[model samples]
Target: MEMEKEFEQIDKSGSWAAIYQDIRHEASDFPCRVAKLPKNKNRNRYRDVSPFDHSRIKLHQEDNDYINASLIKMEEAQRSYILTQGPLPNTCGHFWEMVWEQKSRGVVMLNRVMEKGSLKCAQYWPQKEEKEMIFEDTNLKLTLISEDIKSYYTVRQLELENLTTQETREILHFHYTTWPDFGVPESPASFLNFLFKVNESGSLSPEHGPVVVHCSAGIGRSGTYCLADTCLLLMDKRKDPSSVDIKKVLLEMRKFRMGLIQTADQLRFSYLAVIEGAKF
Candidate 1:
């Protein structure tokens, strides 16, 4: 489990203990790192719902032919486009389809979020029926990346009903408070266990296919989760953990996909979250 290499890295802030000294956190904003994403598998861990919470969300109505969506597959699919993320409203399944389609094309961006996040995430997803036109607005289909944003919108749409900012704050507050903080002694362990559970239960590993994870900004929460995942893969395989430049990974992600990890705040928060949660 010791993922150390002889290569020396400067870790000025020993403030975070679980984060090793050899881990170089600061260089330029973007570091040089190579992280591998799992392919073509649904690497989610939320399979069976807890017995106490029964909402009948997962579909049980299977009797005939099956089709996956409500959006039309654009003819521009052949161009190998970058994957899109939130401001999506109720259509979370569409987001899943988006990730699936990207994986199918051998092109993947990043999918990260916090403890409680939806595929598209309530805070950051866009409603398709009203916002399809906006998807075209981001010019994401062609530009391929973006790292400019403010508070990292949760979900936005052309429809008025979907624009309830009050309800949005409430939901965000719920998740924000719900996530186990680093101060909690067992929170990190629990989260990792949760992550492993999601990884194992969902089987959405990129190795089999592409996996999609999201949160409000798709950066702070998502970036932290992604960094943990990539590093875990390296740790699991007994590789040099320091070799992974998390900032670099995020930068590539921002470039590979638009409007990702946009602010320094998101990066700082995510980095702290990951290192703080590193210890059980």
Candidate 2:
């Protein structure tokens, strides 16, 4: 209640920009570990998408192993999420390898294969007719067992197999396809519904590895989803949703990965989502 009112007061007082500017300033001080690793720069989908030194997730091997991803853990929420960029055509294998090695049970993809006629994310998963997709580079094959297509989102059950180790695991892929390049969702209802669907799957629980969350660049939309989800969980845990400081929560998340909640609109949308979500 107090937090919501404070947000409103901040908005009415026209200090939102000031608050956001401070966040941007603080984000700049974070070290870009991927940049320091010259070999990893080429692995990034977008030149600007780099992980911080403190939270950068390293690959298991020293040879031909690189993936642009970060592991973010919110202990309070008991949620661990892997924030990563959309897989490049060449990095699709490495992408799956990360999933296999990291023990991730769920992939929450926030972008589409094509957005506004531009290729935002590679078609990493198998299509409807194609029962399976193989990434020879990573020596992995993803077999599609089921797909539930909704009006705004799609849920897919894919079985990931490491041909090298002869090991297999079921992976749940949750794809949200309506958000735009520079906009927020229509409402929190649909997005939260999709979030809860993933949550109910036991993917985000502590028992499993981190749930991978990504959009085109991973930081923008991915961070927004993570921030909203974390705040909602925090509110429930404390039984005082309004007591959660949205800015503080976002800043803490940014320490793990730079440039979370990309825009002022995104920041505002996150607050809105948290306010509405806490009611539930």
Candidate 3:
């Protein structure tokens, strides 16, 4: 009820889009190299979804180098996350190429493979009853070792093998099944539960490499989760419910990656979750 009231106030002011526009203008001054490289043109699933030149991730070895991925580093929280778009049919190999090259310990997928009659993400993981799926182009194979089913998310133990070196690495896959494209989770409790579960595996720990986080576009919902989690962590450290300025922190986060928060409702929901999370 309180969250709804806050949403109503934001609606009356009609400031969500206003703030978003401000962000857009602020972002333009920053450097962008998406179109500078002709090879990166087709790498983007949508023409508008391009990684900023300063923060874009580049693979070590690729013929026509292009992968829509970015690195987001939060020093205060001591966390780094690779935010990227959902893999297209042709980019699946490159997506896994990123996982291998970055040495990422896990992948946090916030969108479903099929949503509302549209293909949001590719079937990158190995299918049921199938032991492995190999990407010849990347010279990598994904083998499913185990899977855990939960009410709102699915956890999978996947082994990524290099066909050339015969070396393999284990990676965790956290798939949040219920989050909508432009909407928040059904409740903060469920959302935080999944976040905590991911943390439990030490994927977000500073000791491990950055975790790969993605949705359809990798900006809207992905940005919201990162903002909420970072704010919650800051609140816990400060022992004050409002110690961290949500808007300021979000603007700063946008520096590392464009479009951190997608909508006013999403921003509102981030506040609700951070407030509720700090309660404990």
Candidate 4:
């Protein structure tokens, strides 16, 4: 069955790597990567049920008061804009419920609020709800989640491998693009070109953006994704690493937002992921 999915993915349009390769070859397509991770952090093994909700935002002075919000679109509405941050203990569940509750009132909540582009996990582990939630709290529709791809992954050490939430297994059925392991940044220019092309012509939607990323916490995968995508964009603008500087990118991420992805390993993974996505 897995082999059938692999064959289908290879023939049709599936992995992020494939889309990237097509983009590199075509130059006319804008590739969209997809990652569907689960909502399980597995913070404590002893507990039967996990209260491990990991959303980062500030809380109201009084509990249960939903923070008021608005979305600020930037760069053709393709950006991660964290509206605020705080300590809300019940935020993950609360936000989830609130989004649904508001739907009955004719308000649709979109998932513009994503993990930090650079890290795949939450900002903190052994999770806690955010106090200051950063979402487009408005009267929109609940189309984002519906449009969402089925998602999840295993907490390998935690001994939990729920196939139902494993988004990779599902998306792999589509067969578009991906890296063998993950690629690096030394030769990212070509890779970005590929991703952009596949996204434009394949089954993938450019607006769906890059794949969802996550590590045990969220920062690692999220950080790597953001760094790689940005570098690809920089490449799209046609600047080679020799002629360009990544420090500016790193610096911005650090000075303005969470800087957990500054380690060499993280940067290397991102670079490799992009280059591999480009197919070299």
Candidate 5:
């Protein structure tokens, strides 16, 4: 009831905008000194977006242990997520290195490589033609094993090999191809379907390390995705799904990474997605 009422109320004129403003104002302004360091400047995709030092993921074997990524833990839901920016050209090796070190089972990409004639994200993975990509800096290699394409998303099976150790692991890449930047998907049904597909893979289970979730800036779409997914899981564990507080959930998520769910529209979409997911 609470979730539904909030969803309906936000539909009124100017209601969502006002509410979104409150969320932005209440968001934590934690220090991100590591991201602002001169040595780590090029690792960030956007100048203003940076990961909080406390929650940021550190590269295990690198002299400079900085990557624009955050480990968001929804303890009650037993969910852990690594929210990050889409890899910059130079950070591609670090991106893969984080995955290998963290033991993440899946990579959730919520944006495209190119959008509106602009490069939103780097081409971090191997293309079907290339078959494999070697990141010499991190000594990691990724091979495309198989790809399943859908109308709105694509799931690719990849083989991540640590060349130094000669060990390899299978990783699933879930790419939501149709979600535009600073916008919602076509519908909650489509988004929920894609979410469920990833969930059913067990990649998101607590047993795994943390699933890597990213978009262009790693805040808007990534935050929405994590918020909706976490809420749905919490709802399942409760007798009354209404007990889940979407705003509070998001606020807690913002603690790990700043400026999640960039627009009023994205917040509205997250509420809709959670409502639909609860019903399904």
Candidate 6:
């Protein structure tokens, strides 16, 4: 009843704009000194979107440990996610390095490789024909084993190998292909269907490392994904799921990474998704 009333008030009053405005006003201004360094500038896909140094993941193998990724830990929900930018051509190797070192079980890509006419993310993983891709810098290889294609999404199984150590691990790639460029999904049903598929895989379990979640800039859609998932998990665990404070939850997430849920529309979609998810 509480949850329904809160959402009902928001819907009846058309207060999404005001709520989003308050979120923007409370967005963090944490220092990102390493991301701003002259030598590390090119490692970033977008100049303005950089990871907070305190939460940024550092590569152990590289002389320069900077990577455009942040580790978002939602302790109460017992969830951890590595929110990162779509791999740039040059930073592709660093991307694999992070996945390998962090022991991530899966990669959740929310954006397409190419959106409209522009390249949103570099082709980081190998396609079927390519079979395999070798990153010389990190000395890691990714080979595609199988792919299951759906109407709006595709799931691929990949084998990640460290050439020097001959150590290999399996990685799952979950790609949501239908999300419109610079916008939210059309409905919560499709989005939750995709999210449930990812959850069913056990990739998001605490036994595994954080799942690497990324989009173009790594904060917009990526943020929505994590926020919705976290809120749903919290709802499932709590005695009263309706008591979950969606806005406060988002504010807590923003402390770890900046500019989560890019627009008012995305924020509204998140609330809708969480509400719908609680039904199941």
**Best-matching candidate per lDDT:** 6
Per residue, candidate 3 scores C-alpha lDDT tens digits across 1-280 of 3434555686789877776676666753356675357676667777766788888888777466568888988788777889999999888999998998888998999989988888988999896637589899999989889999899889999999989999999999998888865567657887778888887898887767799999988988888778888877776677554558777778878887777777767777777777677665
Descending-lDDT candidate ranking: 6, 5, 2, 3, 1, 4
Q: Write the per-residue lDDT of candidate 1 for residues 80-158, one digit (tens) a residue.
A: 1222233234334334334333342122122324333444333333324333322331112111112222221121111
Over 4 Å off, model 6: none
Provide the TM-score for each candidate, comma-separated: 0.38, 0.93, 0.89, 0.35, 0.97, 0.97
Pairs that collide, model 5: none
Clashes of each: 34, 1, 0, 76, 0, 0
The 0-to-1 C-alpha lDDT of every candidate, in the order given, reads: 0.32, 0.83, 0.80, 0.31, 0.91, 0.92
Error of 3 at 77 (Å): 1.5
Overlapping backbone residue pairs in candidate 2 total 1
Better of 2 and 6 by lDDT: 6
Q: Give the residue spans of candidate 2 off by over 4 A.
A: 33-38, 129-131
The better-scoring model by TM-score among 1 and 4 is: 1
Q: Which of the two candidates, 3 or 4, achieves a greater lDDT against the reference?
A: 3
- In candidate 1, position 83 carries an lDDT of 25
**Model 1 Cα RMSD, Å?**
17.0
Q: Write the per-residue lDDT of candidate 2 for residues 146-238, one digit (tens) a residue.
A: 989998899999999999888899999999978865578767788888878988998987777799999988988898899989988888788
For model 5, the local distance difference test gives: 0.91
